[PDB]
Amino acid sequence: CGAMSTAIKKRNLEVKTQMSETIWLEPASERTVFLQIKNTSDKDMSGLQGKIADAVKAKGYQVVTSPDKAYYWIQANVLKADKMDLRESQGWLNRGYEGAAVGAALGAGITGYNSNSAGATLGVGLAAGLVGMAADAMVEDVNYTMITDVQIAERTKATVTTDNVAALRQGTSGAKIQTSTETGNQHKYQTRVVSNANKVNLKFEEAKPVLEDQLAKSIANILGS
Amino acid sequence: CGAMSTAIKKRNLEVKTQMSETIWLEPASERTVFLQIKNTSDKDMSGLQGKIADAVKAKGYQVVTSPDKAYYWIQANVLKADKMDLRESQGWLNRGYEGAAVGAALGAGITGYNSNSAGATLGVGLAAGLVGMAADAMVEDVNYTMITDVQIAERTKATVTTDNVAALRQGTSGAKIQTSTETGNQHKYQTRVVSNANKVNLKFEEAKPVLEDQLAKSIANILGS
Amino acid sequence: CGAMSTAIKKRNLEVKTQMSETIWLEPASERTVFLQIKNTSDKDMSGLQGKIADAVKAKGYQVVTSPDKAYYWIQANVLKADKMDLRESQGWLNRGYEGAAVGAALGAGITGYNSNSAGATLGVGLAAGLVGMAADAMVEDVNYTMITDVQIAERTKATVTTDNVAALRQGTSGAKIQTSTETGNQHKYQTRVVSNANKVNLKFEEAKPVLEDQLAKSIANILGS
Amino acid sequence: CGAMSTAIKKRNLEVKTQMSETIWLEPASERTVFLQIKNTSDKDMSGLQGKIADAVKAKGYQVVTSPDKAYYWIQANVLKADKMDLRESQGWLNRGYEGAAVGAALGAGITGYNSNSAGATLGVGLAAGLVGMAADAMVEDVNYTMITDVQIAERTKATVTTDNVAALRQGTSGAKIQTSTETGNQHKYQTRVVSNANKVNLKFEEAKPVLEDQLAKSIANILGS
Amino acid sequence: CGAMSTAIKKRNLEVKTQMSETIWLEPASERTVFLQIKNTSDKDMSGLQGKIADAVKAKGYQVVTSPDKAYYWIQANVLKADKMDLRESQGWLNRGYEGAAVGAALGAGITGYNSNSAGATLGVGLAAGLVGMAADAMVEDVNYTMITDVQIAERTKATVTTDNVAALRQGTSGAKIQTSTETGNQHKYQTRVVSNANKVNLKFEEAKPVLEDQLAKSIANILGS
Amino acid sequence: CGAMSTAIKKRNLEVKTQMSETIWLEPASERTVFLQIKNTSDKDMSGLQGKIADAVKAKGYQVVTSPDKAYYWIQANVLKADKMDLRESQGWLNRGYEGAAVGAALGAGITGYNSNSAGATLGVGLAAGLVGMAADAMVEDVNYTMITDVQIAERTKATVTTDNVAALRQGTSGAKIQTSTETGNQHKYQTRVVSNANKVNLKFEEAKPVLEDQLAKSIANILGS
Amino acid sequence: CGAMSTAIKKRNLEVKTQMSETIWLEPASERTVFLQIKNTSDKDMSGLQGKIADAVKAKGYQVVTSPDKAYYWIQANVLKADKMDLRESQGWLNRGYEGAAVGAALGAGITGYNSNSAGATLGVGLAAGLVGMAADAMVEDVNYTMITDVQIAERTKATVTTDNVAALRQGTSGAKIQTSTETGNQHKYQTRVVSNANKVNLKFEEAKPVLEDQLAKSIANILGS
Amino acid sequence: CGAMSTAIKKRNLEVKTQMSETIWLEPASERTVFLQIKNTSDKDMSGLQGKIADAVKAKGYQVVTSPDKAYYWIQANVLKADKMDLRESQGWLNRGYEGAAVGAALGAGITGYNSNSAGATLGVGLAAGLVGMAADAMVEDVNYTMITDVQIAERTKATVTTDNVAALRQGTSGAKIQTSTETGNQHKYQTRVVSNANKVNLKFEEAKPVLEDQLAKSIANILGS
Amino acid sequence: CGAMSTAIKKRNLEVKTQMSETIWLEPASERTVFLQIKNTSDKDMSGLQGKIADAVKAKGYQVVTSPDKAYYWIQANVLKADKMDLRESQGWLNRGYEGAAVGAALGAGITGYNSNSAGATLGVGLAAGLVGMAADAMVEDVNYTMITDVQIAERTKATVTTDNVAALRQGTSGAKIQTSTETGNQHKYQTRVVSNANKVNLKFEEAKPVLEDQLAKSIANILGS
């Protein structure tokens, strides 16, 4: 019954996309944008860059290839992707005990009909319980979580000093500290986007296109209009 | 019965809009306002800018298009949007167990009437229990939460130094620290608005207009009169 | 019975108004006051400014329109407003289970009178239980909470330096820090007022006038006499 | 029975007045005092100033009207006032369940006398239970809490530098910091007084005079003799 | 029975007086003492100054009236006074349930004697239970707590700089900081005395003289001999 | 039954690969890459370097052997590898008690058939219980966790100062602190990759190729295109 | 049965070797290595040095005897070794109660066969219970944990200053702080290796060779190739 | 039975010796060692110095008597020694209740044989229970814990400054701080060794020789070879 | 039975002596020692000084009387002594309830023998229960804890500056801070020794000699040989 409740409840693909914080951009008349999209997750999003480009072009911006002559940069990295079962949150009643119980109780459906108390009743009841447990275990409330990192670069007129500071860990004992200083006319801001795709027995190939659509729309809407 | 209680209780769309903190503006005789509204959430709020403009014009302010000649700026970003089920807070009695129980108990309504103990009683009881569980599971106490970031800019006479400081994270190890300094005659303040729309089996298309109305009224009332 | 207890207990509108901290003003012979009242909440408090003006005039102070020639400023912002059900604090026994139980037990009132055990007894009992649950669910112990921010300005003779410091958050990564310095002959102090209006099935239109009265009286009494 | 216990226990008005900390004043031969009493609470304490003046005059001090020629200042503000029910601390056994139970058990008083098991017994028992629940709910153990802030000013011969420092919060983001410096021959000290008035079904009009008496006596006794 | 146990246990007035910390005074041949006793509590301790003077004179010290020519100062302030019921610590078994139970069980004393099962037995039992509950509720284990602040001043030969520092809170936002510096030949030390008076149904008029005696003896014994 | 549920649920090899944080690389026209892969874990991943080289070459980059003339460095170390049983999370119902119980209950399958209550029934039941416990204990839900450290070096034009700081612990008492400074034109960033391979009775030889494939794809995708 | 489950589960020697953190070594053409292996644990690991030397030679490195002419140093210390019983984690069901229970229940195997209720049944049952408890207690799930400290030294060209700082504790009261400074051309890094050997009734002589093999392979693989 | 389980489990002397941290010594050609072993514990370890000397000589080092001409110093102090009962960890079932229960149940062994229900059965049962409780209480799972502090001194060429800092506590109030500075050519490092000897009814005289052997071997192995 | 278990378990005097931390003394050829032993505890340890002197003389050291010509100082203070009952750790089953229960159950020993059910059986049972409770209460598992502070002074050649710093508390308010500086050629170190003497119904006069022996041996062994 729990599997039936899960199947009835989350019978439709539900997709959520949430930005972490807001990046404020001053109004400007420049239109050039340069995109750089990477994917270091096990899942596949090959069309994300194209969808981002289409959404950006829909706002009047012009997408260029050489980063030198672009006023805006959209750097995105699909960093992490995980798949989990929400039914596992309860721990119990998920392995298949309830389905097994229902299947076993189904044996009363054979004690009251046709041959009964003939030994075959126990076998039929055991088979029904096993089938019920298998069916209950094969129903999964799958949720895909995806973490994307976005870095927006905006060209300015004030000199910007970038101070690279890295502390490369070195075997418990210590670390190597690297520091450097550069000067350039470009501001960079970061943000994080979290995506969720929930369904019953969901396969990522079905959730991929709408996930890409929502992520591209959000990242493009960072730019505004 | 729990589903019936939820349906009776939250039978009307309830909308709440709460501002985080107060932004104090000194009295002034200037009227020009420039609006910039963005939406990086999965939900659609397309009429928010128009409603904000109408509410601002209702207060005697004049909305202009070029930010250079505007005394006030209203920068808003509909940052986040989430949908949740309040019935999930209890965890149990929400999957549909209670409705299933009521449906099963309905079988006594067929044991006392017409044919009984004929085997068909068990089938009718099981069907009624399944239908009751399905009906109980299909009743949702949905709540939509919306997070909006507002940034108000007011022109002043004192020189304002903006110190851009960003710490762009770089792979566990370190970060790139960007710093810059600009000078301009403009103060900027921030605030956050949280909106909630609650109803039973609510669809966001119904809650959208009143949500926009309340959000626009609050953001415009920041300006006063 | 719980709904009956709630209805009996909070049968009268109860309104509480509490200031957070005390603002100490030195004795002075000046009388001019300038009011500025804003409302960024979903609730409507339109008469608050007029009531504040009347209460201030009742103390001998004179209300002026131009802030330049006013010795005192009363800046108020009705910031937040929320509505909650106190019965929800128990969680259970609030959905309507107790009323349903009473309604079901009412079926014994039909088993002992007129026709009984005729099948219609179960139907009448179920209808009575449903009606009891509906009646229990429709009784709400509503409490409206209002948060108001007050800022009192008093003109002095010592030069006051205002150091505007703002840290506008910028996308997880960083922030823009704005700093400015002004000099003027005016001190400003803040405070917070919390208002509560409690009743059974209360509508805010009934609680609005007394809420405004108490809030205006408190804010005016800040000035003393 | 619980309501009866509460009524028997707290049948008399109990008033407590507790000062927070001690303000030490050096012995002096000066007698002039200037009073300034304000009330920013919803409760009415109009006679507090007169009672303070009478208590101060009873100690040999002389009350003056112009603060310039007063050696001592007594600045008081009745800041907060709240009303609560102590029976609510238990949560349960307070709504009226126990009174309802007693009223229902009273039905045995009609089963053993006159007509019985006639249907009217159930109605009489239900009416008695309802009346008992209403009576139990209508008994309240009310406690009024009052918070008063006292500021005593004493004239000295050493130059006292007052450094006004205020951090006016500005919309989550930041704050405006106001600083100023003045020089004068006056020390100021603060303290807090907490008053409690407890009774059953107490109305504040009855507890007002003794509350004022105790508060005035404490504030005057700060001065000593 | 619990009330009987409390009455038997704390049948005698028990008074405890505890000093917080020790004030060390160097041996000296000076005898002059100046007393200054104040009372800012709701309780009345009028004879405390006289008892302190008597105890000090019993040690060979001489009490003077003008503070200028006194080597020692004894400044005392009876700051706080509270009254509580120790039986309330258990919460339950204190309202009167146990006495009510005993009174109800007393009805068996009328079922076995004279007329019985005549209806009057229930009435007599109910009256006995009510009387028992009333008697149990009217027995109170009262404890009076008194907090006194003591400040001892001793004249010395080294110059003592007193730095008055006060932070007068100003409405959530900020504070006014007052600082001053004086020079004088006098050291001052503080301490706290806590007094407790415990009895059953105790009235403060009975506990006042012994409380004053113990407090005066302790404060005088600070001086030694 | 629990073992059957585990076998049905995790019947397919599930491999997850998650990067810790994002390493941002500026766009560049350089293609040369130098690989250095080490493995300090007990598991064997010998083909990881070849797969990384193939994936990098698929992106248009050119792999060189001498690190001096390489623009990019990919340094990877398969640091840790652990194997655990997820069924051990429950602690109980995993040792084999449930399988033993089922096997023992199987004895009723021999009491109802053929010879019964002949002593041999107990022996057959005990053997069946032992076999069931053994079968339940031999089903393992194995999960392999692999921790890999990645260090990417990118050649730049700004001088980079590396400050080696190490605190070699010396016997509880103290430490030897080594510090040195070098200058070079190369930035280095770190990151961590976590891999999981889950199955029932999984042998690492089966999970090795897919684990290597996913890890190589992620590390190569760090470079982008 | 628990002992049987443990024996079935961990019937094979399971050995795990995990490095704590990664030591990064720059690519170099030098091959000379100097080994120094010590063992301050109670267990015997005598072949570890030879296995490390063989593994290092298998990578093309050349092992030398004089540390002066060695480019690399491999300093290792087998610091700690502990042996524990995993069955002790449950605390109960481990002493032998379950085996005793099974042995006692075996007495029913003698009540149903041959002589019974003859007194000898109790003796046989007691002997069987004692033997079962002894057998259950004699089955141990032994786990050997080994902690090894590794220190790798690499010759460089930059001057390295070693600051020896030691705080030798001196009897609760204090410490003796020793500080010294040396200069040399050698970097040193540390790391920790944790080894586990798990089996039923395992003797360390069986787990020693594979433990040495894995530890040597890991330490050598630090060097790479 | 619990005593029997303990006796069966820990029937053999188990000795563990664990060093806290590793002391790293640079390779050197010097051989001279000077030993200084002290024992401030209640237990007797007289042969520890001789065993340390033998183990050191077995490594090729030469033991000298005058510390002036020794390159290495081995300073050891057997600081603490404690004896505990592991069975006390359970608290209950250790005093002897279980043995008493078994002894009492043994009375059924006399009710079924020879004379019975003759009064002597109760006496025999009581005596058996007392004997069983005594036997259960006399079985102890004893564990001896020893804490040893080791201080190794190594002669160097760099000047080492020792800063003696001690804070001798002085009666709650304060402390006497002693500081001094010396210069010498010697480094000193510390470490701690923890030894455990576990057995049933173990006497320290049996565990002493192997404890000394393991401790000496570990301390000598600090030096290496 | 619990008292019997305690008496059987701790039937022999068990004495433990544990030093807190190690005091390291450099090797030296000086022999002179000066002892100073004080006892500020309620217990009597009069022979401790003599035993310390004997133990020190047994090591070849020479004890002198004038501290000026002594190379070593042994300053010891037997600071604290406490006596506790370990049986009180359980709280319950210690007052004597179990012994009372056994004594009461002994009444069955008189119901089955001689006269019975004659009223005298109850009296004999009550007397036996009272005697059993008294006997159980009179068995105490006494543990004496002794805390000793040791201060060892060693003469050196480096100048040692002692900075006396004391913060004498002055009545809650403040403190008097005393500071002084002296110079001398002597180092001082501290340590703490904890002694425990455990037995059933132990009297300190029996545990005194062995306590002194162990404490003296430990303090003397601080010096070594």
Author numbering:
A (entry chain J), B (entry chain A), C (entry chain B), D (entry chain C), E (entry chain D), F (entry chain I), ...: 1 to 225
Copy text from the publication.
Following transfer of IncF-like plasmids, recipients become refractory to a second wave of conjugation with the same plasmid via entry (TraS) and surface (TraT) exclusion mechanisms. SFX, which is mediated by the OMP TraT, is specific for Gram-negative bacteria. TraT is a highly expressed ~24 kDa lipoprotein with a copy number of approximately 29,000–84,000 copies/cell. In this work, we determined the cryo-EM structure of TraT encoded by pKpQIL (TraTpKpQIL) and the F (TraTF) plasmid derivative, pOX38, at 2.47 Å and 2.66 Å resolution respectively. This revealed that lipidated TraT oligomerises into a decameric champagne cork-like structure, composing of a transmembrane α-helical barrel domain and an extracellular ring domain.
To study the structural basis of SFX specificity, the structure of TraTF was also determined. The cryo-EM structure has an overall resolution of 2.66 Å (Fourier shell correlation (FSC) = 0.143 criterion; Fig. 5a, Supplementary Fig. 4 and Supplementary Table 1). Like TraTpKpQIL, TraTF consists of ten identical protomers that form a transmembrane α-helical barrel domain and an extracellular ring-like domain. The TraTF monomer comprises the same secondary structure elements as shown for TraTpKpQIL and exhibits a similar conformation. TraTpKpQIL and TraTF can be superimposed with an rmsd of 0.523 Å over 225 Cα atoms. While TraTpKpQIL and TraTF (85% amino acid identity) exhibit SFX plasmid specificity, their structures are highly conserved. Interestingly, most of the amino acid differences in the TraTF are predominantly smaller side chains such as alanine or glycine residues without changing the charge profile of the β-sandwich domain; no changes are found inside the TraT cavity, suggesting that the β-sandwich domain is likely the site of possible interaction with partner proteins from the donor. The conjugation frequency of pKpQIL into ICC8001-pBAD-traTF and ICC8001-pBAD-empty recipients did not display significant differences, suggesting that TraTF cannot exclude pKpQIL. Although our data together with previous work indicate that MPS and the pilus are not part of the SFX process, the subtle amino acid differences between the TraT sequences provide the high degree of specificity. It is likely that specificity is driven by either the α2 or/and β-hairpin motif as the amino acids display low conservation.
